[PDB]
Amino acid sequence: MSHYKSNVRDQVFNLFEVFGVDKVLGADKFSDLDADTAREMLTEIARLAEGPIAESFVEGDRNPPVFDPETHTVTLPEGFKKSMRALFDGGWDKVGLAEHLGGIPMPRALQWALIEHILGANPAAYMYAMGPGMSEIFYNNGTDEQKKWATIAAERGWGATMVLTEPDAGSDVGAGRTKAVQQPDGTWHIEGVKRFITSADSDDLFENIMHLVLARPEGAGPGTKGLSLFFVPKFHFDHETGEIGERNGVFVTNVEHKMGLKVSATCELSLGQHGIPAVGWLVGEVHNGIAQMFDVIEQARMMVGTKAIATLSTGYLNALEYAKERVQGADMTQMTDKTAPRVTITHHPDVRRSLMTQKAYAEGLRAIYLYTATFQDAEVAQAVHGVDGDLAARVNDLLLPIVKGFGSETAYAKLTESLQTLGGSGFLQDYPIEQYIRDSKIDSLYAGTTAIQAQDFFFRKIIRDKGQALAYVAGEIEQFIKNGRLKTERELLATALADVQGMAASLTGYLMAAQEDAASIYKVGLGSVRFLMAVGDLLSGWLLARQAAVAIEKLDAGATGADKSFYEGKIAAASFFAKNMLPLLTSTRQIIENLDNDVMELDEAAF
Amino acid sequence: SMSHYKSNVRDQVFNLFEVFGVDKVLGADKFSDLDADTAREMLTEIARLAEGPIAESFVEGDRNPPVFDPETHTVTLPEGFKKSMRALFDGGWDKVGLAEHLGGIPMPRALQWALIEHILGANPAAYMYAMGPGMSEIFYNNGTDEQKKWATIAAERGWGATMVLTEPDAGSDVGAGRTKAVQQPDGTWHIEGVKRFITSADSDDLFENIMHLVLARPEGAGPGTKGLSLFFVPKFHFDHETGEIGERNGVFVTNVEHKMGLKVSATCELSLGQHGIPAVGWLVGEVHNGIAQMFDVIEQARMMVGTKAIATLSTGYLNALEYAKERVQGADMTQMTDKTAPRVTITHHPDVRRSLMTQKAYAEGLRAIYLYTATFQDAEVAQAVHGVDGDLAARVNDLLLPIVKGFGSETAYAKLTESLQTLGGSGFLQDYPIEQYIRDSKIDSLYAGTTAIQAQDFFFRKIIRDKGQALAYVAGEIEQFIKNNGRLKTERELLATALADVQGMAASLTGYLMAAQEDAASIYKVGLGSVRFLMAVGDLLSGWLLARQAAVAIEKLDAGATGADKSFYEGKIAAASFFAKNMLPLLTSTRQIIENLDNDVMELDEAAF
Numbered sequence A: 001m002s003h004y005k006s007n008v009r010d011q012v013f014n015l016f017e018v019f020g021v022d023k024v025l026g027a028d029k030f031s032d033l034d035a036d037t038a039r040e041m042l043t044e045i046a047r048l049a050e051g052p053i054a055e056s057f058v059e060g061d062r063n064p065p066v067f068d069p070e071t072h073t074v075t076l077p078e079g080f081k082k083s084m085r086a087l088f089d090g091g092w093d094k095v096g097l098a099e100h101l102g103g104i105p106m107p108r109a110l111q112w113a114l115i116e117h118i119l120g121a122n123p124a125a126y127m128y129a130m131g132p133g134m135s136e137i138f139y140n141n142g143t144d145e146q147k148k149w150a151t152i153a154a155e156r157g158w159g160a161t162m163v164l165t166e167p168d169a170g171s172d173v174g175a176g177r178t179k180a181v182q183q184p185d186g187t188w189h190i191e192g193v194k195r196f197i198t199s200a201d202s203d204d205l206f207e208n209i210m211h212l213v214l215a216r217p218e219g220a221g222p223g224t225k226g227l228s229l230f231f232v233p234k235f236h237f238d239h240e241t242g243e244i245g246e247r248n249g250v251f252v253t254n255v256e257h258k259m260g261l262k263v264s265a266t267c268e269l270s271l272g273q274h275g276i277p278a279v280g281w282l283v284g285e286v287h288n289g290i291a292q293m294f295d296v297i298e299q300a301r302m303m304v305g306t307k308a309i310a311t312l313s314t315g316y317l318n319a320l321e322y323a324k325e326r327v328q329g330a331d332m333t334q335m336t337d338k339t340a341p342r343v344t345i346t347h348h349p350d351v352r353r354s355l356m357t358q359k360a361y362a363e364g365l366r367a368i369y370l371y372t373a374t375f376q377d378a379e380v381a382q383a384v385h386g387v388d389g390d391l392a393a394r395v396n397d398l399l400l401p402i403v404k405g406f407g408s409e410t411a412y413a414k415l416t417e418s419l420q421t422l423g424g425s426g427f428l429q430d431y432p433i434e435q436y437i438r439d440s441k442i443d444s445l446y447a448g449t450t451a452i453q454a455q456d457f458f459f460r461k462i463i464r465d466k467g468q469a470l471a472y473v474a475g476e477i478e479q480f481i482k483n484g485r486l487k488t489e490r491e492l493l494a495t496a497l498a499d500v501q502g503m504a505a506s507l508t509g510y511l512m513a514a515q516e517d518a519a520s521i522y523k524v525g526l527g528s529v530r531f532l533m534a535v536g537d538l539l540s541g542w543l544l545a546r547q548a549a550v551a552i553e554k555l556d557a558g559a560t561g562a563d564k565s566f567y568e569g570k571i572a573a574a575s576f577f578a579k580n581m582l583p584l585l586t587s588t589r590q591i592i593e594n595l596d597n598d599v600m601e602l603d604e605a606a607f
Numbered sequence B: 001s002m003s004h005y006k007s008n009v010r011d012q013v014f015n016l017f018e019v020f021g022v023d024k025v026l027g028a029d030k031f032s033d034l035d036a037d038t039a040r041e042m043l044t045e046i047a048r049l050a051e052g053p054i055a056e057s058f059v060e061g062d063r064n065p066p067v068f069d070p071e072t073h074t075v076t077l078p079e080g081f082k083k084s085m086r087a088l089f090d091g092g093w094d095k096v097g098l099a100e101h102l103g104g105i106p107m108p109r110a111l112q113w114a115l116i117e118h119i120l121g122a123n124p125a126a127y128m129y130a131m132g133p134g135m136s137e138i139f140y141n142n143g144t145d146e147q148k149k150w151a152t153i154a155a156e157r158g159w160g161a162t163m164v165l166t167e168p169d170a171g172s173d174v175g176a177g178r179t180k181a182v183q184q185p186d187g188t189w190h191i192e193g194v195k196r197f198i199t200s201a202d203s204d205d206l207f208e209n210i211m212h213l214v215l216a217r218p219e220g221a222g223p224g225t226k227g228l229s230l231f232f233v234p235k236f237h238f239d240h241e242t243g244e245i246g247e248r249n250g251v252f253v254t255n256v257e258h259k260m261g262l263k264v265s266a267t268c269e270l271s272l273g274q275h276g277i278p279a280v281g282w283l284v285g286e287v288h289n290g291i292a293q294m295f296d297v298i299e300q301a302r303m304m305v306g307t308k309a310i311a312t313l314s315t316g317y318l319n320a321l322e323y324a325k326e327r328v329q330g331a332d333m334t335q336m337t338d339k340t341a342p343r344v345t346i347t348h349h350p351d352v353r354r355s356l357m358t359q360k361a362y363a364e365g366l367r368a369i370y371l372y373t374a375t376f377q378d379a380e381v382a383q384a385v386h387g388v389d390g391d392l393a394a395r396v397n398d399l400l401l402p403i404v405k406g407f408g409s410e411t412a413y414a415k416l417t418e419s420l421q422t423l424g425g426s427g428f429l430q431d432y433p434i435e436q437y438i439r440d441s442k443i444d445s446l447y448a449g450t451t452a453i454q455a456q457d458f459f460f461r462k463i464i465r466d467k468g469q470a471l472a473y474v475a476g477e478i479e480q481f482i483k484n485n486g487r488l489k490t491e492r493e494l495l496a497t498a499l500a501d502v503q504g505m506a507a508s509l510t511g512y513l514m515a516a517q518e519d520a521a522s523i524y525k526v527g528l529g530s531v532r533f534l535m536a537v538g539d540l541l542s543g544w545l546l547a548r549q550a551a552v553a554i555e556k557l558d559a560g561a562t563g564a565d566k567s568f569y570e571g572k573i574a575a576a577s578f579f580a581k582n583m584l585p586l587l588t589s590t591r592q593i594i595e596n597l598d599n600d601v602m603e604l605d606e607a608a609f
C-alpha cells in the first residue's frame, strides 16, 4: 500500500470511548449525523488518504512546483493535481463547512479527526483545499453584500490564501508596510510586497483565488491595531453571478526552495507592482484587521499542530511495521552466545524503548488535539465536559498554542526515533520517514514560531485570562488524581501537576516583579518555551492515564482479540510515559526557579 | 549559500594550547620538527581553504548529486566537487597525521582532528573520499612486509579506499555476513558476495585505484565475527613493484543509494565475483583476524563521524548567530506593551539568547570532548598533558570514542534544530545551509554503528570488561576539579550533583547486570537505560570541560585580557555557567528514571504496540 498508515481505531477510541462525542451526535446542530455515519466517514477518508492522496506524496517532493516568470504562475506536478481532484470530487474540502455554504454539520472534534488523514498522507493537499473554510470566515466577518460573494466562493470552490508576512514583518506582524488607498467608489488599492505566502498560486486547480490581505490604510495608526483586512481576488468577478472577469493586480513573483513541504507553493506576492491595481474590499467594511485575521490564524495554528501530530503517527506506524520484520542480532539474554538464534528487532530493549516513546507521544498528542477540539463547539463542551460557552472558548484558546507549539516540536523530535528504528535504511528516500522529518520541520515556524506560541500561552492565555482556563484544566487533572492499578501513575501525575504549578508561580513572580525591576521580565522569556513544553507533557500523561483507565474498564468487561491488544497498549503507554517522561519536569521546575539574567547581560560579542 | 562554512580556529587553539597544553609536546620527540607557530599556521591555512574552495561545492554536491551508470558500474561526481577534492589533494590535506614514512607530517592526533574538523564542517564527504591514505596506513600497520610495500605505493599515489562490512542481513550484526572467501592454490582468495551501503565504493576519476578492505568468511570458517577475515581487494590489479595499474578486478558497484543527505558521498551496493570475473583478495597480514583488524578502521571512522557532527553543529551555530545579530524583529521585552517602541535585533530576545547559548555551550563542549579524547590517542601526549601511561591512555580513548560518536551525533542533530529555529521561516529555505546541515548530519547516529550500538559498547566493553578503570580515572579528574577562587562555586556544586547522578546511573545499571545472574531478563533493564546513560556521561563531560575552560578564561581575564580576547573569555564563563544551570540538573531526573526501570515494556505483547 501507500506510505500513509492511518489509525482510525485510535481516533474512534478517543472520540467515543474517552470523550463521548457520540453523545451529541443525532441532537440539535448534529441532528442528522449519527455515530455510525461518523465512523463511516473516518474510514472513508482514511482510505482516500491511504489511496489517491498518499499516491502523490513522493512525486510532490521529487518533482516540485515550478514558477513561470512568463505568466507569473506556478505549475504543479500532474499526479498531485490528480490527488487534489480526488479530494474535491469527494467533497472533502467542505468538511465542517456551514450547511448554508454546502457543508455537513459536525463536531469540530470529528472534523479535525477527518483532516488528520489528509495531513498524514499529503498535508499540502489539505492546505490547497482550505478555500471553502476561508470563504466561511470571510462570510462570518463580511457585510451582507460580501456574504453573497463568500457564498459564491464556497460553492465554486475557490482557493484562498492568508497574506500577512513581509520581509521585515514576520513574528512582528504590526511592522508591515503594505499600504491601502481608498478609491472614490469605496474599493481600495493595495500596494506592497508580501513574503512566504502559501498557495499564492496553484496552477489550474481553481478558477479563482481569494487573497485575504492585511494592509495599513493611509493615515492609520501603527502596529497591528492599525491594520485592516482586505478581500483581494486573483480575478475580478461578477458580484451577482460569480462569472470570472479581468485579472486583478496581485501576482506571484517567486517560489521558495524549501527543505520540505515542497509541493506547497510558497510565494512572494506582489500587490499593485505590475501595472494594474490590486483592488481590495475592506472586510466587514470596518477597520479591524488583526482581530479578523486571527479568526484565520486560529484555524491555521490548529491545522499545523494536527499536521505535525498526523505525521508523527504515520512515522511511528511505519517504523513499527519495519521493526516487526527486521531480523538483526540475538536476544539480549543470549548476547554472549554467538550462535544464538537471530531475533526481530522488536526484541531489543532499546527498540522497544524507542517504539513506546513514539507510541506514547503520538497517541498522547492525538488525545490533546481531540480534547482541544471538544472545546471548539459550545454544544460539545456542554455535553461532554459540563462547561459553558465562555469557559469553553477560553480553554480552547489556552490549548491552541499547546497543539501548535508542543505538537510541532514534539512530532519532529520523536520522528528522530522513528527514523533510527530503520537503521541505515531510515536515511534512504526509499522510506518515507526522512520526508516526514523535512516536511514537519516547518511546523515549528509558520503560523507563529514556538517562541511566539509560548509567549501567547503565558501572556495572553494565562495572565490576561487571570488563569481561569488554566485553573479549570488543572482541576480536571487533580480530580483524576484524587480518584489501584493506576495508583503509581496517579502519584507521578501529582508530582507533575505540582511541578507545572511551581513553574507557573515562578514565571508569574518574574513577571509581577518586573513592575519594580524591568529586566525581571526577561526570566519569563527565558522560561516560557520550557513551560509550554512541560504543560504539554503533563497533558499527555494525564490523557494517556485517562485512556488507560478506560482500557482497564473494557478489559475487565471482557475485551478479546485485537481490542484486548489495543487496550493493553494503552495501559503500557500510560505507565511508560508516567515513569519515563513526567519526572523530568521536576528538574525543569528547579531550573525555572533558578533562572537568572546572566545570559541577558553578556556582551553580544561574547557569543 | 556557497560561503556557508564558518570556522572557529580561535576556539581550537584555545583548547589545544590554553586548556590542554598540547604545545608542550610540539618540538619534542616524535613532533621534533613541528613547533607551535607552525601548528597554528596550519589551522589557519586549512580553515581558509575549507571556507573557500572546499565549501564552494557544498551546495552543488547536494543539488547536483552523483549519477550512476549501471553498465560501466561507475559514478559521475559533479565537477565543482571534484575541483574541491583537487584543492584538498594539492595541499596535502589527505595526509594530515599520516606516518612520515608514508609521506605525512607527524603531529599529535589532537592537532590532526582539529585540522580535519574544517574539512568536515565545509564539505564532510570530501574528507571521507580523502581517507585513502589513512586506510593505507592501517593496511601498512596490519600487513606483511610485502603488503607494507603495496601500502606505501597506495599512500604515495593517493589511492582511495573503502571499508566493506555491511550486507542487507548484516548491519549492526556484522557477524551475520555471508560474503565468502575461496582460497586459491597460489595463496590469494576469491571473494564472492554482495555488500551494501559502501561509502565511496566508486568515486569517478578522483583516484587511479581504490583499496576495498573487505570482511568475508573463509570457506569452512566458524560463525559470527570471530570467523571473519579481512581482505585487500583492489579495484584494479596493479604491479606490486611499481604500482602501475593493471586489469580491472572483479569488484563492481551495482547500485547507488538515494539518501536524505550526504548526497555527494556515493553509497553503493558492491558486488564481488558476481560478473564472471574473480574478485581477488589478499589476506591482510596473512592471518585470520578480520574483526580485530577491521576495528582499527572502525575506531577511526567512529571518531570521524563524531567529529563530523560536532563540526557541523559549530558552523550551524555560527551561521545562526550571524543571522541573529542582523535580524530586526519586534520590541525589547521590557517595552512589549508599547507598540511604538524601537524595534530590536533578535539577539535582544530572551528565547533567542537561550537558543544561542544552548547552541554555543553544546558546540564548544563537544569540541572540547573530541579534542580531549584525541589527547589520549598518543601515549606521548597523554603522558605530557595528563600524566597517564600508555595502557590507561588507550583504555580512556576507548571509553571516550562512543561518547564522541554516540553523544556527538545525537547532540549535534538535536541542537541544529535550535540553529534552524533562530532564522525563523528563512531557516526552512535551502538558501541557508542549516537545513542541509540537518539532512547531512542525520546519518551520523546510524553509520559506523547506531547510537544503541555505541551505548552497548560503552557499557559492556568500555566499562564492565574494562573493570571500570578508565571510567574511574575520568571520574577522579572531575572530582578533583570539583574539590579545587569561589567564582565557580555554583558550577562546581552543580557538577558534583551531576557526577553523583552519573555514578548513581552506573551503579543501578551494574546492579541490573548482576541481577541477571539470577533472572536473565533483568539484563533488559541495562538495554533500556544504556542510551540515556551514554548521553548523561556526555552531558557531564561537556559541563566539566566547559567549567575547566571557564577557569582558564577567568585566569586570562584576571591577568588583563582586552578586546576580542576579553569577549571570547567572557563567553566561556557564560557558557559554563549556563550549561551547569540549565542542562546538568536534568541528570538528576534521569538517574531516578533509570533507578526505576522495569520490564513491563519488554513483557507487552508485540501486538499491543
Ligand SMILES: Cc1cc2nc3c(=O)[nH]c(=O)nc-3n(C[C@H](O)[C@H](O)[C@H](O)COP(=O)(O)OP(=O)(O)OC[C@H]3O[C@@H](n4cnc5c(N)ncnc54)[C@H](O)[C@@H]3O)c2cc1C
Pocket: A161, A162, A163, A164, A165, A167, A169, A170, A171, A172, A195, A196, A197, A198, A199, A258, A261, A266, A442, A445, A446, A447, A448, A449, A450, A451, A452, B327, B328, B329, B330, B331, B346, B349, B350, B351, B352, B421, B422, B423, B424, B425, B426, B428
Ligand atoms: C513554509 C512557510 C509558509 C508560510 N506561509 C505563510 C502564509 O501563507 N501567510 C503568511 O502570512 N505567512 C506565511 N509564512 C510566514 C511565517 O509565518 C513566518 O516565517 C513566521 O511567522 C516567522 O517569521 P519570520 O520568518 O520573519 O521570523 P522572525 O520573526 O524574524 O523570527 C526569527 C527568530 O526570532 C524569534 N523572535 C522573533 N520575534 C520574537 C519575539 N518578540 N520574542 C522572542 N523571539 C522572537 C523567532 O522565534 C525566531 O526564532 C510562511 C512561512 C514559511 C516558512
Ligand SMILES: Cc1cc2nc3c(=O)[nH]c(=O)nc-3n(C[C@H](O)[C@H](O)[C@H](O)COP(=O)(O)OP(=O)(O)OC[C@H]3O[C@@H](n4cnc5c(N)ncnc54)[C@H](O)[C@@H]3O)c2cc1C
Pocket: A326, A327, A328, A329, A330, A345, A348, A349, A350, A351, A420, A421, A422, A423, A424, A425, A427, B162, B163, B164, B165, B166, B168, B170, B171, B172, B173, B196, B197, B198, B199, B200, B259, B262, B267, B443, B446, B447, B448, B449, B450, B451, B452, B453
Ligand atoms: C550513508 C551510509 C553509509 C554507510 N557506509 C558504510 C560503509 O562504507 N561501510 C560499511 O561497512 N557500512 C556502511 N554503512 C552501514 C551502516 O553502518 C549500517 O547502516 C548500520 O550499522 C546499521 O545497520 P543496519 O542499517 O542494517 O540497521 P539494523 O542493524 O537493522 O538496525 C535497525 C535498528 O535496530 C537496532 N538494533 C540492531 N541491533 C541491535 C541490538 N543488538 N541491540 C539493540 N538495538 C539493535 C538499531 O540500533 C536500529 O535502531 C553505511 C550506512 C549508511 C546509512
